[model samples]
Target: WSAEDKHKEGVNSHLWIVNRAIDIMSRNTTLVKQDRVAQLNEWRTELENGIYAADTENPYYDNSTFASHFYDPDNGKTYIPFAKQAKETGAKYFKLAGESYKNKDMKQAFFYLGLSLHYLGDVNQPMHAANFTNLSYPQGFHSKYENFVDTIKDNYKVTDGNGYWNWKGTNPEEWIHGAAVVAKQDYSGIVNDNTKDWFVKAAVSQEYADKWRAEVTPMTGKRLMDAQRVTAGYIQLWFDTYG
Candidate 1:
């Protein structure tokens, strides 16, 4: 694929994941009222459109598309500045949600809140926090894993099925960072934070893809389900705090 196609795949994949989280959250009685849920669904559709509002023809696309990865050179660990930024950005949009609701602009309120949720939903992807990007590996590997996860999202549920939703920390950053650390050790099996070990030096082969697919795919699916649950928890927290 051309670079432009690759960019589209990445941004659209993010939109897909965010939409999936919204779907899972929508089913929960704890989330919001039916009216609010309707608004969220509309807002999610709008947010996905907003992701493509930029010129997809531009190969560069939005830098925020790749914002989920962060590396700490001194500590030699992979952390997520993007997830933190998303949390902060989400708060601003959340504030707008309340303001819009107060103004009776319910559409804008839902749209703004959907923006906030997008950030929270993003960090749930293991690749996002695990620092698994094209900078390290082949260009297609990260996208491939994400596509596979999307294909299988409905077939699985969070391991609990009921979902575990008691967030201990104040914000999504802690959840995101903690999950990243766990994935680094649990999925990748590398305690040391050196980033070099994760990248693909040669052209990506189907053999390599097949191997990681067999191994990493299941772990990523579990993590995605956790993200769905964690995301729903945060949404409930936002409603409780703001409503």
Candidate 2:
């Protein structure tokens, strides 16, 4: 799929899953303590897994990949706009969360807005931004790369839907902006034919997307840590600057 599509899926998945978790928590506070922050974190974890699964091991496009950044004739520039797209989505989610928080609706606002953080986090991963999907190595490095990530996180629960809410930060936008700066610098390899075909398969069938997501490995797991640290700083910034 396209980068924009990935951002859309990533952001929307984060919001939708968080919303579902809140609904679940709303029904039974006793289930997870009704602690908004813990609950949001759980949902965030689930959202991450959901995003990874959705993007990696797509069932339909067995070996397909995301669309490469092609030149846009209309704009006279390459349409590699994922970084900006992430920023826009982050700001949008932050606004939504902030408005909801102000109205005392932490369940919906913070969790939903935290979805943008999810996208920003994914984009920062060197593997996520790399064009290794179509590696030309003699030993099928593409599949091996996928295996490397999967093996490391094979047992980690992608989502903790049943956890309590335990969010600490006050600013969501700071988290997004901070992530953007790092992601721009973490741009891996340039998208080539091989990377664009097997791993992404631009606008391919939904089944294909699912297959790819399933196959994704945490080869770039270190970046995930960086994403969290920077996100915390941004969250702090939101509180410092806005709160």
Candidate 3:
């Protein structure tokens, strides 16, 4: 209802995630460059998609995959999962971020890194990893869940986690995939009680909001925390490998 409230969740989920990520990152030493983190914070609003999704005029950020998927190139599969697309998105931007670093364009580098982290955040969200568009969106699952997280996000402040150690940007795709794969377990939980209704009651909550919120909050907290950790890993790698 107020200014800060306006920016809290519905409008800035990625921004909120990235902000917390940099804050957690700020507490560390050696692994992440404080200058890089500081500058990133100063400019993170431009990081995710370089315009942030709220910028409706040119709403796409860095050409990122909005949600995640699961895909296996081999084995005659009839359907394609979405998380894999996000995996590729993360990988591509991960390298692009590194290129900006190599070119000494630190700001631009952070932008791409922001894009990379955004995808990382997507893959970590249980529904986003599970073809959120259908399973969660146009239905009460995805939008409602993320919106709920944004509202109570402060309750899940995550600060400590591990990096993708020994990573040379080789398989952030797998890293992305694993996040989604693991999310599959919780995805069921997020969609709890409503598992039978895919349209999710004309895309509205029919007591599912209560059931969804009660059961899914814990997973939301955990998923959000994981998102922070993975984001840190990518940013840390950006500096550890290049800075």
Candidate 4:
């Protein structure tokens, strides 16, 4: 693709990542307890964990293989570097907890750690960190994948299925499965954050999203039906056990 086109895809992908984050966060919020002490204690901890799982760190850009070199020409425009900045905002909040409150409550520290963990997991997804990514083909290439998601989204029945928000096992590899898994997020904070970044990335992510979305769109139906399948298994068999 041309530089111009790459720029467009970069922007779109950034936005798509933000949207995914939001989807995870909003639905996961249900896992938090609303009460103040709970909010201050475990509830807060849960939030921190979620953020950790939902971490904005771009594995591909800041740390993964995609960071230094592109696997393909399509990856040329991916601005994965900014993903760190995205999660840093949340991570910073936890890291600086000492300044915001005094006494250094041990319970609170653990809670904050949990929140950070959530964001951490988020940064791991190849897809999350991927630029100009897609599982689709033909004319749609990318943008159409997002449209495909729209179609599958409309068809998936909203069941009272179990939400898999937290990481259960010790294995880090299992984290990726959670993205389109059982905890299909309801709220949009994470998704919003991702999309906002895409806008900042401008044309790059737009083009990328256009193609990537189309690729994933057809699978949306299957993804929805088997949402938590791999993730839940990963969590139960690997994460929960290992952790």
Report model 4's TM-score to 2 decimal places: 0.31
lDDT of 1 at 171: 55
Number of colliding residue pairs in model 1:
1
Per-residue lDDT over 144-197 for candidate 4, one digit per residue giving the tens place of the 0 to 100 score = 334344333534433432435444434332343333222223213213344434
* Best first by lDDT, ranked: 3, 1, 2, 4
What residue pairs are clashing in model 1?
Answer: 136-199
TM-score preference between candidates 2 and 4, better one: 2
Full-model lDDT, candidate 2: 0.40
Which residues of candidate 4, in runs, are more than 4 Å off?
Answer: 1-140, 162-168, 177-218, 228-243
TM-score of every prediction relative to native: 0.64, 0.43, 0.73, 0.31
Which regions of candidate 1 are displaced past 4 Å?
1-35, 42-44, 50-65, 68-84, 138-140, 158-163, 169-208
Best of the two (2, 3) by TM-score = 3
- Taking the tens digit of each residue's C-alpha lDDT, what string does model 1 give over 1-243? 011222243434445444445555566566345554565565654544433422142221245343423322223344444332333444566577667767877666665665555545544554544556644445556655555555555555543323345564655445545444544444353112322223242235565445555555566666666666666666555555556
Which stretches in model 2 have alpha-carbon errors above 4 Å? 1-84, 127-150, 153-178, 184-221, 238-243
lDDT of each: 0.49, 0.40, 0.58, 0.34
- Look at candidate 3 and tell me the lDDT of residue 207: 70
Q: Predict model 4's lDDT versus the native.
A: 0.34
Candidate 3 whole-model C-alpha lDDT, 0 to 1: 0.58
Taking all chains together, the TM-score of candidate 2 against the true structure is 0.43
